[PDB]
Amino acid sequence: GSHMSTNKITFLLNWEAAPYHIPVYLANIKGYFKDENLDIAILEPSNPSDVTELVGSGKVDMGLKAMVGTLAAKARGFPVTSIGSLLDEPFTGICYLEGSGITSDFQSLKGKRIGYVGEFGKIQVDELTKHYGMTPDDYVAVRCGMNVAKYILEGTIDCGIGIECIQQVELEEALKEQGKDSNDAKMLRIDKLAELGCCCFCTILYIANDKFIAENPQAVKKFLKAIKRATDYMLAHPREAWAEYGNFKPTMQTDLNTKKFQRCYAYFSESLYNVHRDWRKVNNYGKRLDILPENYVPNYTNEYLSWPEPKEVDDPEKAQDLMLKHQEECKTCGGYKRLVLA
């Protein structure tokens, strides 16, 4: 006896369900996948380090992963390709609490316990040390999975790698509930420490197994159409979309997750396009880190997107500064406002 066929396509998130996963869940909830005759089985990982080996080996069809992990996957023999962007350049850094002895000076990290998520965070911090008169032995790296912010708050690490709209928000809100100044939640931006220009290495991407892409090109195209439809809706109607997401996934109804969503809002890619200049820069960064070979070719494609490509940006420094001001403003206001492009 054989087995019946399933048309269910597995889609593995990069993390436990989080506010920025809204386009995937909303495309399902609102029937946008069904309208494209797709059945998407959304799966969440217990351990984010499992994602690329599962997608790359073909055990899972599609999913999400940040740019460093995506590039490294194919270099390690797990052939995935980025087919689009979800969250563009979210600020990423070593998060800490003001008054613990850590400052904006990287050298203040001497003798500290620094949390990282899975694997590459430690590689990044280790590489930074030589640029600041330090060695990897000058700190203790602690693998924390999805609990970096929690462990900072609980004091079992002194600081740790996280993104501004997720981990930093958790720190800020926890400080407030304690009666502490939320401004005490700070980060040493990793793009600045590594002298990279922006947090391009932290863009979260839609990825797919190469064989899956080859064997299901229509499905990939239609998946991205449905995602685009949900993304358009969410960007136009964030409050209503957020309510819908939370009705299905009640974890998202909390005040904390709502604060996170407000902070994520400006980062969502409206076009889903892979940004060429970012990929070029992170590829070179990965080579510097000794996780990608010289001559490595970036593993992304825009071939499955069915609408026009936005123009390249000559001045992302300017745009990044606008983002800074926007995010700082978020700390004291409600509401949802997208950045206006130059």
Add this chain to the structure above:
Amino acid sequence: GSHMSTNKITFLLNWEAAPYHIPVYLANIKGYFKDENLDIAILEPSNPSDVTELVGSGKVDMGLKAMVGTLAAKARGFPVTSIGSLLDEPFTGICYLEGSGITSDFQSLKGKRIGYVGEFGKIQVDELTKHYGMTPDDYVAVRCGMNVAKYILEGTIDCGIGIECIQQVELEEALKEQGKDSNDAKMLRIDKLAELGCCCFCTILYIANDKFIAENPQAVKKFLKAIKRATDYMLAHPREAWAEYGNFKPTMQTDLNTKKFQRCYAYFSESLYNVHRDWRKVNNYGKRLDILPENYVPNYTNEYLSWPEPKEVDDPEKAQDLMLKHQEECKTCGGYKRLVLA
């Protein structure tokens, strides 16, 4: 070539991470899988209805599923086999709130919106109607996924199928939040409605893809040894094991989830053995529901377990009465008490 193999084995839960998943997470957390040279990738479904098609098609290697869904999967051409038991005969019923017009009489469900999880809940309630002077048109079945208790509380359904140690606990605690009597959270036990004698049909099982079992019998045996090791530890040291689980999965650190764990505790299978009489009874029930063909054989095996099989329980009725009393006491007094075997 460059494409590498993975050793990861995918394990898909039957539900969002919940208290009764503790043996799986603990086997991982405490390094019991590692000690058996296993790398288990624990995955959580966003839609429990996806589980058996994924495991049965081979898209996922192993997972959890309750008995009705497990039987139905192989009957429908998605070959999975139960290799052991996780949660034995948990009380399951149509949960409701006192004062809404619903009573212990099934006829009080006329004109009600009744929530079910995925598919078979509706089939079960539909079949029950004929035994209580009703038809499937006498109520409205509403598909709710993992949010049955939530939607009862919010009033968008009137009642719905749930397990005593999960959904009924959510209702009890929410009633306390409203400053109401937690005893207003009740259920019509479905085993009693269906004349089944016990909730055999709701037992939650360890399942695996048939091809995976055939090609990897050694890994299956090792997996079950590691699960048994974690199960032994958790049953012996519930407070400590629970704290370990919550440190990894912070949602489990809540008072609500702790109360759920206390209510789950007596149901865990100590031996992991498939209970023959239950499989016999539920196979016949499935045939009665027209979900299994007349000649269907039950899809389980105990051959991958590595310790003695406990004797068949002499007096199942006596055991079920002890459990009823135990769970009543657990509601009001909490704690961790295992029933003494005859």
